Design a protein around this ligand. Sequence first.
Ligand SMILES: CNC(=O)c1cccc2cc[nH]c12
Ligand SMILES: [Zn+2]
Ligand SMILES: [Zn+2]
Ligand SMILES: [Zn+2]
Length: 461
Amino acid sequence: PTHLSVDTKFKTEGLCVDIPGIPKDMTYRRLISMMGFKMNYQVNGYPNMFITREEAIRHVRAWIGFDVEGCHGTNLPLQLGFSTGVNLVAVPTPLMYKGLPWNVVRIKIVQMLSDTLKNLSDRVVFVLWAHGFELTSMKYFVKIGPERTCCLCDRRATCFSTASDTYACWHHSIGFDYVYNPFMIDVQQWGFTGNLQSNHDLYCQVHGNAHVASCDAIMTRCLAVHECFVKRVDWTIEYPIIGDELKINAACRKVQHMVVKAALLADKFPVLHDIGNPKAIKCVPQADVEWKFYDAQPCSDKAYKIEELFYSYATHSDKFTDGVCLFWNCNVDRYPANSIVCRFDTRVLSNLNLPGCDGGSLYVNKHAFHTPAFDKSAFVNLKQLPFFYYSDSPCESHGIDYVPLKSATCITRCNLGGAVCRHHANEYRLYLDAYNMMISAGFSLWVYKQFDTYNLWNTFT
Ligand SMILES: CNC(=O)c1cccc2cc[nH]c12
Ligand SMILES: [Zn+2]
Ligand SMILES: [Zn+2]
Ligand SMILES: [Zn+2]
């Protein structure tokens, strides 16, 4: 069982208000036929328009919530809402657009999906809370057939043009009018009691219901993300490389060793309390410090209460007041004052970060991590960690042309002694690039208020 069988049953109770008299017994095969799509027995890579919950999770970057509200059935106009906040009105003659015929509506749909998805996925997954009109309207903007490649490149075809009779991916679809071979999934098939708003509002206070189709489309994708990434967590699923994943991850490792090593040199803490990843390793292996590890998986729902991390039942818990605490991506409600902290800012706009549930976001870099909403108050006992570069390594070149470096934040023997050497200038600039890579990727660094880089200069005496 790799794909969803067309002979699987589709619960139709949710479709009987827009479609009165629909059979209770219904397969995907009969539903697709009813929707106007002739699969004509095809073994060419597109076995079903609808996908499994598992296939949907592997393709989370393609998720676009879709809702159609029957505004006034090729007799009345339809309001087409997308989780992008777009509302289009199709006529059969929070961004809201006036009534227009399908021939122009379908052009806008291709433009919008292509701009949204080109840098995220090779496909679209229409996430629905199906009531009837969204499925019966797909024949107006969707064409299906064998799997294909773009006319201008080797990527999988996601759009079709009736004007030129050619196929294109999301990058080369300008002027294309049909969505080609889309995927879709009905959230109602997962067995819910009650309507969309009641199920959504159980877990999210951030998306309201302004009664437009995009509002439902957003709430639908939000509820799907909650079910698949907040309540259900699968860290085994790997996701393709689409951006700066390898550079961002390497930068995080360089930044972590740098910041922790400098803190241990500047304030000579005897013990370090490392909380978070149960698979974490000593980021500064040569440090003198007593390195103690505490297991806490990434919290995907709400941030950990600092108090519950010490709830040791009938035994005494450790005193974190001695030494320093390292919370590298361990999201707590209020950090202790003696901490070094890396906290992902969920508000960041990027191709790695997808909108999440209740203010949080779904960070997808090798794995999907739903992260709780960023909260500035978690850092009240700390300060924003300033940029600095520290190096005790020898001033030795080993060899890109050179411009002399002048910086107050290059903490080296050469800078103390008057002039930065070529090696430390190359290393400072590389470290500044990795630092900016990680900050721009959404990460934020915080440190105990007594942290001072002035204390680092005397480690050369
Ligand atoms: C930081 N957390 C602790 O010191 C600790 C120590 C011993 C048991 C438990 C259970 C939860 N936390 C514990
Ligand atoms: Zn292409
Ligand atoms: Zn929501
Ligand atoms: Zn030097």
